[PDB]
Amino acid sequence: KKPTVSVFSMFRYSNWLDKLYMVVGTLAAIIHGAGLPLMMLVFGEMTDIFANAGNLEDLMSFMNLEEDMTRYAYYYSGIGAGVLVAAYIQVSFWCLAAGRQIHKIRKQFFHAIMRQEIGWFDVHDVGELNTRLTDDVSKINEGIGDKIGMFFQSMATFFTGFIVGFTRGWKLTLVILAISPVLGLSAAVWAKILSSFTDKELLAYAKAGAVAEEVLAAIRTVIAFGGQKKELERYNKNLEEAKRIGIKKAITANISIGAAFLLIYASYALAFWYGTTLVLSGEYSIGQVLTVFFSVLIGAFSVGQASPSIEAFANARGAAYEIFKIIDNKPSIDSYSKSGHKPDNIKGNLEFRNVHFSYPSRKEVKILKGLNLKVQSGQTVALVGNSGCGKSTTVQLMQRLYDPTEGMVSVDGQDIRTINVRFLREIIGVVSQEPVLFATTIAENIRYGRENVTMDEIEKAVKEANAYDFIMKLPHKFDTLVGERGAQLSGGQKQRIAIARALVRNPKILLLDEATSALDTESEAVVQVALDKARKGRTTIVIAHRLSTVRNADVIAGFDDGVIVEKGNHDELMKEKGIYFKLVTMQTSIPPVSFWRIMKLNLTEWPYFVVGVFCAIINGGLQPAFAIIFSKIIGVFTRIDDPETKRQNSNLFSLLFLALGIISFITFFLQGFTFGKAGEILTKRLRYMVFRSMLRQDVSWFDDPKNTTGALTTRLANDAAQVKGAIGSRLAVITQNIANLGTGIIISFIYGWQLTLLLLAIVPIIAIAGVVEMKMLSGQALKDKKELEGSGKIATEAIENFRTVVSLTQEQKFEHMYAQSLQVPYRNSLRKAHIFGITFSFTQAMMYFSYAGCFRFGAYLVAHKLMSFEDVLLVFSAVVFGAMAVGQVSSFAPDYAKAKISAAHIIMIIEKTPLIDSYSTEGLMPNTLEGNVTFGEVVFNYPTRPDIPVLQGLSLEVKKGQTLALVGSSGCGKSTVVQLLERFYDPLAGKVLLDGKEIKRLNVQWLRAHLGIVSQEPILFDCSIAENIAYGDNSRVVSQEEIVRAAKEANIHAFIESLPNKYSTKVGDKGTQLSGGQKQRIAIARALVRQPHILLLDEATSALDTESEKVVQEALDKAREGRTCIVIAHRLSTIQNADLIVVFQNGRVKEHGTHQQLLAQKGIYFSMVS
């Protein structure tokens, strides 16, 4: 973060080869940059040879104009040969040196990250650390890459040009030197603008991007509450600012380039005026004036080309400071370490004694105050207590995830503090609540625990757990491919295979932490069976929720208020009547779009396009005008006239130069203004329409795997801003290229056809040379960050779940995987360095060889009296310099192909029409609904995978005032029925009624606004508390009285009153931290403001504590009252407070009856409640 680090300390991983590369690259760069200010020295003397003979011929009316020009053809070929070799060395060597140093840094930085222990990752954000690995290293690479050689080349050009200017003629050099600072400043500004191109500016758009992300991620709730119009309004309000910022950016860029060109042409005019004054006197010659002026001007404008390199180097140092800080940091308990104490046969005897512990982030407070245990081999320890006493702190402390501030922990006599770190974490097997799985196969995940394991032990471990049927029935058996972070598998299966993975390690001291994790009922029972199967000959500390499995335990340690007080088995705790007994009583592809359609999108802004095309014509018509004026101004001295006529003509031509500069600035500003405004308006309109279309489309469209939230926001952020490049930029590029190149070719053919025909063969190569130079100066080949995606995925999945990784003792494994994934792109970059170097060198050298070829043929033609020197200059400066300008213009513009590809998607999504339209005004909104929801033989299938049906003709019938309960396995039709009753999807078959009226003819907006729902998981908006609670009945301004009475009804109007600012806190962020109980209560409060006639809930309490669950449950029970409320919950939570129970079996209903019938009969419901 600090750029104040020594220059040479940056080059710390420099081998001998890298240092030799740097020195030879620097020498080659100094050589290469001395060519252009030297070609204007040969070009000056060549002009004198042509001009001197021209005076002699005119006086006589071309003897040695063909012999002398032979020598100067060699000089151009020599300078071109040097640039052919020097430029190859400069670009390739510096890129090779940087490509090698960064490879060491990238591997070494990942070595430091894995070395750091838990606690370092608490202070250092995992997201920020992941960002530094992928972006800061790239910043370093850009800083120490080709830009250093570019800086050396620019400085060499500056010094060589000024030396040549002073040596040839000092009088003219001083005049340009006086105005040199402003030229250098303008060049530096233009270079910084050019380098800061091709990177998307999302700082302005982030405001709207946050809203888009939150809406699209939570599209279910937005559709449920019918707030889509409000979200669209908010999105437009946010979009306006980004539109303004984009307009300003475009205007600034065009102003900068226009100022650069204006200064160039003004310098031309002043220098030529003073040069004519000198030449008429006789101090100088036309060739000497050309040499001095061109050399000094190139030198002055080249000192600004090195400006981006200095800033890049400073930023590289600043970004490398933190990376080097992490590298040289030594953890105290690092897993690597160096050997350590290691017993042969550790029997296993845990020991806690005076354990005082505090979390490093908040060490001012303490959680542990003297925990002490005496569990020996073969026993079992259980922990019971309230939420907040620190029942997982000891779990993390046992396997040396931290260090106790006071006291000691011992195992088998010896203290843990003197023990080999790898051995300890190897003998300590652990499981947690979340069964995190890696992207590799199930068998590969199993092998991840211990590498040197064959298939036989994996089979044994799977047999021990419960997977030898679940994975065998699945395709691909053991090697089943885990995809999309374990999308196929569900929670219980992941937990079972995580138990198997823990079994694979064959540990000696097991350690379970909240393994239950409320995995419904059957999954929970199976997990408990697997857990008890696992615990046979192992010292375990079993922390369990619901406090039912803790009954059977050798020592049920009572974790209450730090130091454990309650102790003993169930009978002793029952006699003592402590926290254990109390809580026990408590519990018991797309075809391309034609250019015409894309053009029609921005048709409403036609005047902008008209003015822009006119300005593009006037702007592109400037290079041939410059060629004509240059040829005329040199021909003024070529011919024999009287001095006064020469002076007057030269002054006229200088004024023409100044007028050209003024026109260039004006047209650049106007073209930028018009085209930028048109593009920004088009982008805003496209984003608005795409967002509206996305909101209108049904849930099935979002459920499609291609249409993910990330993909949709990427479309809305990138493609809707790239579409503008297929109309305005395309028109400007084509118009400018035509109006310069065609005009130059036509003018050249009129004045000379032989030389034009010869020069028409190098035009493609010169244009490609300009394109290559412009695509290297802007770093377009360096902003790319592809071919490292696999390594980035490995790094992310190893740094995000670093706790599981460090508990699994796998650092060398991930290090080697990262190195292997980095190996191939290293060699690819090494080859691409040479490829790019040779391409740049050849393309640059063609520009130097063109002089020799063109002027040799021109010498022949002039000798044989077929044209004049002025015509040769006109043809050259119109066919070659025009080609350079064509190549440069065609590169400083967005790519046309990607623009049309994005426009295809934009046009596809804009015109899309849904099935369940959410904007259909047609409807039959009645007076009052009695909430009679019935289902008849309804068969439904998911749209993404219409292969196995979910519903098999359900039959359902509910009257007003009756509370219906439905129970079944997890993932069954209950959630799908909830979705379908709200008309989220379309049933394939069956009928849905509502007070005798079919659901087809009911208005969608009326239905979704006529009832309220509570989501299975708590979903919250980042708006204020007042807005988040007023996000219920929309299209109506609500008062605070309704809000407060709903909060009172929801049993939440205590915590809100116990908060600063009351009903104004920024909910979902800052320090609100509602946990889960308060989130559920505020969600049901938001659902209660609408006063729905029918209320739907689905597993509100899923993974809450043993205290906040009761408050939410009683709030739900109170909220029902006289409403047609459907309820899905965890078994006895609300199943017995209802009236009728519905049983689901493979989607279709199984039995229908009251509680007494189902309980008395030996049915499935009795089976799962026995």
Ligand SMILES: O[C@@H](COc1cccc2ncccc12)CN1CCN([C@@H]2c3ccccc3[C@@H]3[C@H](c4ccccc42)C3(F)F)CC1
């Ligand atoms: O390609 C080399 C070598 O070019 C030649 C070699 C040999 C003979 C030649 N004969 C005639 C013309 C070029 C010749 C020169 N580039 C030409 C292109 N510069 C670009 C550039 C881009 C767009 C508009 C104007 C400019 C000009 C300088 C500049 C300043 C800062 C950042 C970038 C640049 C500027 F703003 F003033 C870099 C140097």
Ligand SMILES: O[C@@H](COc1cccc2ncccc12)CN1CCN([C@@H]2c3ccccc3[C@@H]3[C@H](c4ccccc42)C3(F)F)CC1
């Ligand atoms: O092709 C033109 C015009 O380019 C464009 C025209 C219109 C629109 C454009 N839009 C985007 C990019 C380029 C555009 C640019 N060359 C390249 C830049 N000059 C090079 C050059 C090289 C290094 C440093 C400074 C310069 C500048 C002039 C100069 C004088 C004598 C010999 C060569 C040159 C100078 F010493 F003062 C020639 C014109």
Ligand SMILES: Nc1ncnc2c1ncn2[C@@H]1O[C@H](COP(=O)(O)OP(=O)(O)OP(=O)(O)O)[C@@H](O)[C@H]1O
């Ligand atoms: N990442 C963390 N950084 C700092 N303090 C934390 C962090 N996680 C938890 N704590 C604090 O550590 C203390 C003990 O946490 P505790 O073990 O009770 O966590 P838990 O997730 O509720 O688990 P358990 O229910 O098993 O006890 C609490 O005061 C808690 O706020």
